[PDB]
Amino acid sequence: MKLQTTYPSNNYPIYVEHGAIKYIGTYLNQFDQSFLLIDEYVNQYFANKFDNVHKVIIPAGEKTKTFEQYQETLEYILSHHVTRNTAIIAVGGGATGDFAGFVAATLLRGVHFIQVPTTILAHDSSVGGKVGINSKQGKNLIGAFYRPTAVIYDLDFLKTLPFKQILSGYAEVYKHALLNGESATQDIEQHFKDREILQSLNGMDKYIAKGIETKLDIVVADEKEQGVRKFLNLGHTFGHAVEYYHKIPHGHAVMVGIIYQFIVANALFDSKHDISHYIQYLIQLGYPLDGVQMVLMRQFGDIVVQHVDQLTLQHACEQLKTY
Numbered sequence: 001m002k003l004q005t006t007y008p009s010n011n012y013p014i015y016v017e018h019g020a021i022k023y024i025g026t027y028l029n030q031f032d033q034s035f036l037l038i039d040e041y042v043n044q045y046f047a048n049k050f051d052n053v054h055k056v057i058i059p060a061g062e063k064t065k066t067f068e069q070y071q072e073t074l075e076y077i078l079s080h081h082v083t084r085n086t087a088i089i090a091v092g093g094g095a096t097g098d099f100a101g102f103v104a105a106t107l108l109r110g111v112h113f114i115q116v117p118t119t120i121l122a123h124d125s126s127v128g129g130k131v132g133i134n135s136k137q138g139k140n141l142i143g144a145f146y147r148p149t150a151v152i153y154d155l156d157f158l159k160t161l162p163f164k165q166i167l168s169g170y171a172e173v174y175k176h177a178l179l180n181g182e183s184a185t186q187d188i189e190q191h192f193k194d195r196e197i198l199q200s201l202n203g204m205d206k207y208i209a210k211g212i213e214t215k216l217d218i219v220v221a222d223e224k225e226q227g228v229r230k231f232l233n234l235g236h237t238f239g240h241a242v243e244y245y246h247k248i249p250h251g252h253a254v255m256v257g258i259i260y261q262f263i264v265a266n267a268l269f270d271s272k273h274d275i276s277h278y279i280q281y282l283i284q285l286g287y288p289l290d291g292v293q294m295v296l297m298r299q300f301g302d303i304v305v306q307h308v309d310q311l312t313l314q315h316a317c318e319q320l321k322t323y
């Protein structure tokens, strides 16, 4: 399946399929040089699937998204007397994509950029143009909006994901379903009903694709997060925090924030959200359970963005600790 952005100009394809890795060669030709920036671990796993093109091994996961690693990689690459017709190919998860993407965005004011996502959670991150690094202050505080030349998503990369990464990635697949509606949420809940099915990845393809289409509507609609793209931050308000203190996986935190979010909506609008229902769903999936802006779902199809006071968040956290 090939998806494609529909902006008034400068659009990119999104190849989602088992074996899409092939499509990378078709591009590589039209580039002077190509820098294969690949994750430390990811390189171990697929160094062979890849062996004018240079491989740059960067730290694992979030370890590379530092301002320091940003200077070193740009410098190292710059030393290779590059040109504006150079491409940065990002092989790895969301962390490498963001980092490599920020290098590609700032190198010579912007060079060519190929996204090669290898995680479930990367179905979300490789789409939309958000790239960047973290700051000693907080998460993705420094970055840019920069459209890749193409997104090449090969589903076979997913076969080697520990369950920990499956769970983490699922949170985003599930967030999109939530944002996509009540019918898509009950649809995905019934399929991925337990840890076993989830861990097997059976049918994740369809849901991943569905997830990309959902976001592809929102980001083409509101590219710079000036309107509806803020709905994508569902459960990231409380998620982004929890993550930075307990350093759990990104997706694990989102789920906790998605629960939290439901609790808050119940306080304000009294949505009558079966919190007990969502909690049990996380338990069945195998999730280890151990005015501030905010994207709140008042009802499926009625997503809102508004401030919330400490007292409401204080009470929303009280309720959550119940579980």
Ligand SMILES: NC(=O)c1ccc[n+]([C@@H]2O[C@H](COP(=O)([O-])OP(=O)(O)OC[C@H]3O[C@@H](n4cnc5c(N)ncnc54)[C@H](O)[C@@H]3O)[C@@H](O)[C@H]2O)c1
Residues within 6 Å of the ligand: 039, 040, 041, 042, 045, 060, 061, 062, 092, 093, 094, 095, 096, 098, 118, 119, 121, 122, 124, 125, 126, 127, 128, 129, 130, 131, 139, 140, 157, 158, 159, 160, 161, 162, 165, 168, 169, 250
């Ligand atoms: N719009 C956006 O740009 C956006 C949206 C969502 C999340 N994010 C960012 O993305 C990151 C989270 O995504 P992530 O989970 O992919 O991060 P990640 O890069 O850290 O990948 C998770 C782990 O999986 C390993 N891994 C990668 N591919 C693998 C594979 N096929 N087999 C086995 N192990 C593999 C990595 O080495 C890493 O240890 C965060 O840094 C977050 O801030 C950005």
Ligand SMILES: [Zn+2]
Residues within 6 Å of the ligand: 124, 172, 236, 254
């Ligand atoms: Zn996210």
